[PDB]
Design a protein that fits this description.
Layout: E1 14-17, H1 23-34, H2 39-46, E2 62-64, E3 70-72, H3 81-86, E4 88-91
Antiparallel strand pairs: 1-4, 2-3
Organism: Mus musculus (Mouse)
GO biological process, one term: meiotic cell cycle
Function: Essential for spermiogenesis.
Length: 92
Protein backbone atom coordinates (compact mmCIF):
# COMPACT_ATOMS: atom_id res chain seq x y z
CA UNK A 1 0.00 0.00 0.00
CA UNK A 2 2.91 2.31 -0.80
CA UNK A 3 3.34 4.84 2.00
CA UNK A 4 1.15 7.53 3.54
CA UNK A 5 1.89 11.22 3.03
CA UNK A 6 4.80 12.71 4.99
CA UNK A 7 3.81 14.97 7.88
CA UNK A 8 7.28 16.31 8.69
CA UNK A 9 8.02 17.19 5.06
CA UNK A 10 5.82 19.32 2.81
CA UNK A 11 6.29 19.25 -0.96
CA UNK A 12 6.07 22.50 -3.00
CA UNK A 13 2.63 23.47 -4.28
CA UNK A 14 3.81 25.42 -7.33
CA UNK A 15 6.63 27.50 -8.79
CA UNK A 16 6.42 31.23 -9.46
CA UNK A 17 8.78 33.93 -10.73
CA UNK A 18 10.27 36.50 -8.37
CA UNK A 19 9.31 40.10 -9.17
CA UNK A 20 11.89 41.97 -7.08
CA UNK A 21 14.80 41.34 -4.73
CA UNK A 22 13.97 40.21 -1.20
CA UNK A 23 15.36 37.94 1.52
CA UNK A 24 12.79 35.48 0.18
CA UNK A 25 14.24 35.58 -3.33
CA UNK A 26 17.95 36.02 -2.61
CA UNK A 27 17.65 33.11 -0.20
CA UNK A 28 15.77 30.93 -2.70
CA UNK A 29 18.51 31.64 -5.22
CA UNK A 30 21.21 30.41 -2.85
CA UNK A 31 19.23 27.32 -1.82
CA UNK A 32 17.98 26.62 -5.33
CA UNK A 33 21.58 26.77 -6.55
CA UNK A 34 22.57 24.16 -3.98
CA UNK A 35 19.77 22.03 -5.42
CA UNK A 36 17.31 22.65 -2.59
CA UNK A 37 13.84 24.17 -2.96
CA UNK A 38 13.85 25.68 0.53
CA UNK A 39 15.52 25.52 3.94
CA UNK A 40 13.22 22.59 4.66
CA UNK A 41 14.91 20.43 2.04
CA UNK A 42 18.33 21.60 3.20
CA UNK A 43 17.69 20.74 6.83
CA UNK A 44 16.60 17.24 5.89
CA UNK A 45 19.81 16.69 3.94
CA UNK A 46 21.96 17.63 6.93
CA UNK A 47 19.28 16.63 9.42
CA UNK A 48 19.60 19.95 11.23
CA UNK A 49 17.38 22.78 12.45
CA UNK A 50 19.56 25.90 12.58
CA UNK A 51 21.18 27.37 9.48
CA UNK A 52 24.38 29.41 9.60
CA UNK A 53 23.46 33.05 9.03
CA UNK A 54 24.96 36.48 9.63
CA UNK A 55 23.37 38.94 12.11
CA UNK A 56 24.05 41.87 9.80
CA UNK A 57 21.32 40.78 7.40
CA UNK A 58 20.65 37.14 8.21
CA UNK A 59 21.79 35.71 4.89
CA UNK A 60 23.13 32.17 4.55
CA UNK A 61 26.87 32.02 5.23
CA UNK A 62 27.37 28.76 3.34
CA UNK A 63 25.34 25.94 1.81
CA UNK A 64 26.31 22.46 0.63
CA UNK A 65 25.21 21.72 -2.94
CA UNK A 66 23.64 18.51 -4.23
CA UNK A 67 27.11 17.59 -5.48
CA UNK A 68 28.36 17.48 -1.89
CA UNK A 69 30.36 20.69 -2.26
CA UNK A 70 30.45 23.59 0.19
CA UNK A 71 29.58 26.88 -1.51
CA UNK A 72 30.34 30.17 0.24
CA UNK A 73 27.76 32.93 -0.16
CA UNK A 74 28.21 36.69 0.08
CA UNK A 75 26.05 38.16 2.84
CA UNK A 76 26.63 41.54 1.20
CA UNK A 77 23.66 41.08 -1.11
CA UNK A 78 24.64 39.08 -4.19
CA UNK A 79 21.34 38.77 -6.05
CA UNK A 80 20.61 41.50 -8.58
CA UNK A 81 17.45 42.51 -10.43
CA UNK A 82 18.82 40.42 -13.29
CA UNK A 83 18.71 37.41 -10.95
CA UNK A 84 15.22 38.22 -9.68
CA UNK A 85 13.77 37.57 -13.13
CA UNK A 86 16.04 34.58 -13.70
CA UNK A 87 15.35 33.36 -10.17
CA UNK A 88 12.17 31.42 -9.46
CA UNK A 89 10.14 31.23 -6.24
CA UNK A 90 8.75 28.03 -4.72
CA UNK A 91 5.38 28.10 -2.97
CA UNK A 92 4.06 25.53 -0.51
Amino acid sequence: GSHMMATSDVKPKSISRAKKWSEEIENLYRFQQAGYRDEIEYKQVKQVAMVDRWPETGYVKKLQRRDNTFFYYNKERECEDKEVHKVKVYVY
